[PDB]
Amino acid sequence: DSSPGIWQLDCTHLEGKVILVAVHVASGYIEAEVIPAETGQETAYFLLKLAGRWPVKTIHTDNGSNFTGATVRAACDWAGIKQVVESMNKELKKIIGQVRDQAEHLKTAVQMAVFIHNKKRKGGIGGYSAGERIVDIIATDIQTKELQKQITKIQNFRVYYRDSRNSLWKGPAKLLWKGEGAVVIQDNSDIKVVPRRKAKIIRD
Amino acid sequence: SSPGIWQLDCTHLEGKVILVAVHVASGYIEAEVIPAETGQETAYFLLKLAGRWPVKTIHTDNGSNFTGATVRAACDWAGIKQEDGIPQSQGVVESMNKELKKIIGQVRDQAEHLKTAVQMAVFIHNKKRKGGIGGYSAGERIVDIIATDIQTKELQKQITKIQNFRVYYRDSRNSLWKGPAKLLWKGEGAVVIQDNSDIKVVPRRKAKIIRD
Ligand SMILES: C[C@@H](CCC(=O)NCCC[N+](C)(C)CCCS(=O)(=O)[O-])[C@H]1CC[C@@H]2[C@H]3[C@H](O)C[C@@H]4C[C@H](O)CC[C@]4(C)[C@@H]3C[C@H](O)[C@@]21C
């Protein structure tokens, strides 16, 4: 659905062979390989590795049998992988050939071409390289989730509160912050600040 | 550079061998079932490791495999370095080999091959956290470690460079020489220095920057 870890897997052909291609959208970072059988199993293995290395929460597919098949679905279920790559594919070849005369198999040409596109910076004015943007982007996503869990954990404590010794206790609202003699709670759509005395907390 | 150190080791399980790359700093493993234990697969597995991640230094376990010639012939293509051999750093990668094994054995009856179980272990170890709400995982620690660097080095390099220049000053309206402060900025009319917990802006006539 919608999760930062979005990738676009696709099959490209060359050398009477097929290269499974993975591309991290937000990043621009790639990671390809030459898969023997373009079956729904070779693609799936390709995910098991990737998913164990980078955080892959969701992927896209170009209908291909080796994609929509339930052969993949198995892994995607195991790893929790809910289920412009075009522009990159060409770029992949743009480099695979130039190096062709420096390696053995095509596979090596394929990887060397990757290594060249990832480290490949964006000029020189503060521009990073896909290998860097991906790491940055994910590093911040980890930090964002961190604060999220941090907030939901604190929400776990519920509060009842009131006003005068003549008012009524309301709630259970969710605790937001606690300090300086007061409690800050979110009653629903309101962020309220109540005196510690006019409040009662309980672990849910 | 701890953010570029990788230890590579080959282990054998119920049949053949497998390559196991470990990012020392985070614990981030990355094993692959290589057919033979030759420096032909090694140089390759290392070629892919370096394209996806930033590899600077390698720490092999001196087995013919990683000592090959067409192995070190690849590192130069990239930018890998290598260092001397050997209870604190040792098991960092071996206490991983059996850690990978202990895991492979729990998903073996679930995988239809060895690789599938090995990866499943790579995946499991890397996503495995260190608690409930707090402790990080190896897959995370590695992005954090690699990311803080990308956005810290070419800015920490400057500070260090300029602070390697010591300075002596005497605060205006007084003639006792304080120093050595560390230099932060040099202008034609004044200097900015960090003494200890102070950042002082000193005129040029009251400072003496030291050559090296
Ligand atoms: C996610 C939280 C962090 C809250 C936190 O962690 N607070 C202490 C909880 C301690 N405990 C749960 C352990 C108590 C359990 C007691 S029990 O008896 O229930 O066991 C953040 C994000 C939104 C909040 C800030 C507001 O937007 C802005 C506001 C401006 C002020 O000028 C000072 C900061 C203040 C009050 C905010 C406080 C705090 O930064 C909040 C709730």
Give the pair of three-digit tokens for residue B176: 């006792």
Q: Number of A to B CB contacts under 8 A, please give it.
A: 75
What is the number of other CB atoms lying within 10 angstroms of the CB of residue A165?
7
Identify whether the C-beta of residue A123 lies closer than 8 Å to the C-beta of residue A129: no
d(CA A4, CA A58): 8
Say yes or no for a CB contact (<8 Å) between B147 and A131.
no
Give the pair of three-digit tokens for residue B24: 């020392």
Torsion-angle region of A45 (φ positive above 0: left; ψ -120 to 50: alpha; else: beta):
alpha
- Residue identified by tokens 């402060």 is B181
Of B53, B77, B123, the CB nearest to A51: B123
Query: Which residue has the CA at smallest separation from atom 6 of ligand 1?
Result: A177
B13 forms beta bridges with B16
Q: Pick the closest to residue A62 from A18, A106, A111 (CA basis).
A: A18
The helix or strand, by DSSP H or E, that contains position B83, with its residue range, turns out to be none
Q: Give the CA radius of gyration of chain A.
A: 25
d(CA B125, CA B95): 13
A154 lines ligand 1 (CB under 6 A): yes
d(CA B163, CA A85): 46
What is each CA distance from B127 to A49, A79, B81, in whole angstroms?
Answer: 13, 10, 29
Burial call B186-211: b when 16+ CB within 10 Å, e when fewer: eeeebbbbeeeeeebebeeebbebee
What is the number of other CB atoms lying within 10 angstroms of the CB of residue B146?
24
Residue in B closest to A99 by C-alpha: B77
Identify whether the C-beta of residue A4 lies closer than 8 Å to the C-beta of residue A26: yes
Resolution in units of Å:
2.8
Strands B166-169 and B31-32 turn out to be: unpaired
Q: Which domains does chain A have, with CATH numbers?
A: 2-144 (3.30.420.10), 145-203 (2.30.30.10)
DSSP for A114-168?
HHHHHH-B--SSS--BHHHHHHHHHHHHHHHHHHHHHHHHHHTEEEEE-SSTTS-
A201 lines ligand 1 (CB under 6 A): yes
* Upstream peptide bond of B180 is cis (omega within 30 degrees of 0): yes
